[PDB]
Design a protein around this ligand. Structure first.
Ligand SMILES: Cc1nc2ccc(NC(=O)CCNC(N)=O)cc2s1
Ligand SMILES: Cc1nc2ccc(NC(=O)CCNC(N)=O)cc2s1
Ligand SMILES: Cc1nc2ccc(NC(=O)CCNC(N)=O)cc2s1
Ligand SMILES: Cc1nc2ccc(NC(=O)CCNC(N)=O)cc2s1
Lengths: 330, 329, 330, 329
């Protein structure tokens, strides 16, 4: 004799990947997570899983053809979860996706049923992975993945408000003429309509915007900054109306989370976690609070000093999620 | 105002220094955009299309990921004034080939689209290089060249950069070597008449043809010609499976944009005018290894081809020249 | 010729680089700036300038030998400033450096004299460049470069407290078990002993560390956070005692500033600029305040809300610097 | 309570996954450290040396740069317990060549130092690959392999990775092509007896020797042998000018660290056992093109050398064995 044997002397046979990531779901969200992770050099092996065989194969092939331009030496796919074995991180993006003029909460029951199949299969092949839930409604689906998986809470992470906070910092950046990296502010709670802008922590160079505008984010705000949060809430609905779905910003947000996990950064992110007994909540609700994310998932939660209104809004967000959650079948 | 209480303006201002425009927000256009953004090649990105909603939606979706990027300005419009001061304009607009349809069948539809696009792009960007991605790429690079009236160094077709990348990936798979360490060139038409240059196929300077002179021929026990057949069929296989191709071409285009933006002077198999080489006496555009930098193609590598490889290259040139003779400007 | 047998030339190009960076001084600081800039792909051309011919050629050849692993296609050097022609950014690291125990202010006259030769030469070949001053005392030498160059203030930037602040965030990160990227705090004023930690702006996820500890950074602080600022001030002296100089952290700090300029990022950095008009400063004092940094240099200044003690400390830093800069011989 | 506990609720009661250790904090060691840090290859970086102050100072200077990096833990100690669980251990410690001194002259000093270093590395990092940088690299890779008890694939010498990068840079400068697009292999000893493989020197698959048969001989009108002479002389000239070399070796080591950490299976000219190849009968380690990945060197490419190139390679092996056979450890 063979040309390979005439060219190369083999001295060694077949080891497990060391930094493998799996993306479940090859829809627009899943492929944007896949491309973003590949372009960030986070994995030595990427595995893709879906139920639509041709689509899955074509997407994997399209990725593989770009191998020369990447540093991920193994791109694999299958409808069979055996392909996901030895993953450090498993990203779930599968299910019904948010529709034009409809809440993400409208996808709940269908995605719970789909997770009843996915989660045990993922768990069977990578019992020590970190689960990263992207599918909507993300906060409810994270709690669901947590209950089905049997994993300790640190290993079940929801993409949550990482994107809402990025959109908020972009918008704040545009108003101020400052790069989003230099605009600080957190959007917590539900990754959806009941999200909470923490105006009290919004700052540039440590300068509290609330200190220069006491009314910041209220109805009395002469600059109507609440409209920036309105823009955050509405963003997915506007993007879906224009292009039919959202993909790029979420793919970049998920890769940002994957980077913190894969490289054990211990950076703080506003991501879905169990808040039972934290803030003002007594229900087994998952929602975004600032978390320290690293190699073991969520190891710590930052306790944000919320104003009485911010606390009320966060309790309201938890209630809206518990309200939907309590009535589900699983 | 809150901005004035927080920030003192000290300076009243300037032209983008490393601007890139992507024409077409279809799957190819959007994969080029995400790839370019994730490689930090531009200080400004402009998007152009004819479908207003889709264009705004794509622009907004990219803008929302700005925190995770290093491209501080992302803009879009149907109006080409948005593309002003681009150093590189990437054209991905036009009809795409169906299963069983040759890229050469897209000619009349895409030339008519280029008749509008090309004069509008060149208008606002004196310093731009035109990078053609739309198909048939070789023919459309000649069309972009004729319409723009640009010098040949400035008009580039993505050509066989992806064909050679695919060939390199497939060779790597057979050998258990990364594509980076698998060398091989696929030249000519980015289509059915492409030419695998078996004479230059190597690992660590070792010629695979020197080890097997039957390499790439029907006599080949390992049927290495099937690797070139797979390169030829690749777009069609992917189209049949997922409906279109996007990721690999996006990465191939960002690779070329990187060499241009960073004046790397790397060698790529890309569409250029070959009048004067291999006995070609006409204004044919096709892929040959080109040195690519800040002024586009400044130099062309003269690949030494065996008589059969040269014959296959002239056959690809005749095929492309025949289609050029059908062009109605 | 072999080159011509292998290659057909199409045109004689205008070889003028688009993103050229010059590093003046090939000492330990200059070379650390050089390697960090090459490893960040910020430049299409890197030029080195020094007065020691052998060391200059040696440093240039060594960086050139690594070209295969880089994306900076031209690395050049000369004692002649003609080699610096058409630079977008010129980083000055040349001059005397602190000996063990030596104040950065002690380098003032020697460095002002060196700058009298350097600055006109830089200006001669790159009249549109942004000047980035790293040589010490940085604040005073930024004033010197400004006066000599005749450039508008936006294009004359001092590395200032970019590193002091990075050290502060690192130390804060170590105390809290959080990545420095998620620890926020600003060290302002002189890049030296009179620097000011802004305790009011020190936070993790927008939670003011002082709101949890009212006595944060004071003598009454049970946890003695003031020692974090003392460690910041002492850092270079401690590193100098141990390794004889500092290099890596300043190199990374300078490339961070180079990145904001070259890529027009408009990020906020605590760097040396004229503060005439802020905190009751009526003179041409250059010192670190948070600045928006982009392609045109310092376009804007963030007005930080200082406590009366913080403002008094900043005005003391301002007076220490003005005492020296007002009497300079040039 | 404490401020930390007022700010943070701990919910989880710490072993690195991609740790790298650099042994020796001289100019080579620190160039390796910064290059690795800037390539984001490790989640933990450990430094080891015998000079306490110097080690502490270097560690501290790296830590102070943590904000600009993605390596969340930088540690150091004289004690090898600090290197626990490394996936890669880079050895740069030992005597370095003076002006006018061969790397081969450092052998006794460096073999004696390796007797202490190698068993302490292996004791705390049983899963690691050993990357030898200290000189003479080829002999020290053999020595580290023998001492360690590690299989030969896990004991790699930086070898000719830098010699080949130097050759590719010089070739690029002569041709006006980026080194990435200039292919050429310098094999054998990382020293005076290195072998430029002229037969494999090519641009885009075009052999330079096919265009110029005299390539690399004294008859060559363009004197391309001066390129290999500059490669051989490079460390001596740089040492004569600046007192040592650091930047190019640092980047060459980070290149090898990348292929290892990311299991790339790229081809590099690095130190491995050549017994059984080109009729070499002894346990000589020298550079040949190797496939490098997560398990180190898994495969060796068999370069087809001309009679003179093969004679030069066997002469390099003979030189190395001349020094190696007289070693006591
Ligand atoms: C039992 C099941 N397992 C899977 C696995 C993947 C997918 N794939 C998608 O749903 C992709 C499209 N969806 C979005 N939102 O992008 C569906 C199912 S159903
Ligand atoms: C006169 C015209 N100007 C344009 C500009 C953009 C587009 N856009 C596309 O064709 C995108 C979809 N096509 C592919 N190949 O992705 C069409 C036209 S028609
Ligand atoms: C008139 C003069 N022009 C120059 C230019 C460069 C240098 N080079 C250094 O000072 C390097 C060493 N110094 C530090 N601080 O690294 C000195 C002079 S004197
Ligand atoms: C028993 C011993 N263990 C060590 C460990 C480190 C070092 N450090 C250096 O040798 C660094 C300087 N040398 C070069 N070549 O850079 C020496 C020794 S001696």
């Amino acid at each position: 004799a063979a040309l390979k044997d005439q060219l190369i002397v083999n001295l060694l046979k077949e080891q497990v990947p060391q930094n493998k990531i799996t993306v479940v779901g090859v829809g627009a969200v899943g492929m944007a997570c896949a491309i973003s992770i590949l372009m960030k050099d986070l994995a030595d092996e990427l595995a893709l899983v879906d139920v639509i065989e041709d689509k899955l194969k074509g997407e994997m092939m399209d990725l593989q053809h770009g191998s020369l331009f990447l540093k991920t030496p193994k791109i694999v796919s299958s409808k069979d979860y055996s392909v996901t074995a030895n993953s450090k991180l498993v990203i779930i993006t599968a299910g019904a996706r948010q529709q034009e003029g409809e809440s993400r909460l409208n996808l709940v029951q269908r995605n719970v049923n789909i997770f009843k199949f996915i989660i045990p299969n993922v768990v069977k092949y990578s019992p020590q992975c970190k689960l990263l839930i992207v599918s909507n409604p993300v906060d409810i689906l994270t709690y669901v993945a947590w209950k089905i998986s049997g994993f300790p809470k640190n290993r079940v992470i929801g993409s949550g408000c990482n994107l809402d906070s990025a959109r908020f910092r972009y918008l704040m950046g545009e108003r101020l003429g400052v790069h989003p990296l230099s605009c600080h502010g957190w959007v917590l709670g539900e990754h959806g309509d009941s999200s909470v802008p923490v105006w009290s922590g919004v700052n540039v160079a440590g300068v509290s915007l609330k200190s220069l505008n006491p009314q910041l984010g209220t109805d009395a705000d002469k600059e109507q900054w609440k409209d920036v949060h309105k823009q955050v809430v509405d963003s997915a609905y506007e993007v879906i109306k224009l292009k039919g779905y959202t993909s790029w910003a979420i793919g970049l947000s998920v890769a940002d989370l994957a980077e913190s996990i894969m490289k054990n950064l211990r950076r703080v992110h506003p991501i879905s976690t169990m808040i039972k007994g934290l803030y003002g909540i007594k229900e087994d609700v998952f929602l975004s609070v600032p978390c320290i994310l690293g190699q073991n998932g969520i190891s710590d939660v930052v306790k944000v000093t919320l104003t009485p209104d911010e606390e009320a809004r966060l309790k309201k967000s938890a209630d809206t999620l518990w309200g939907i959650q309590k009535e589900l079948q699983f």
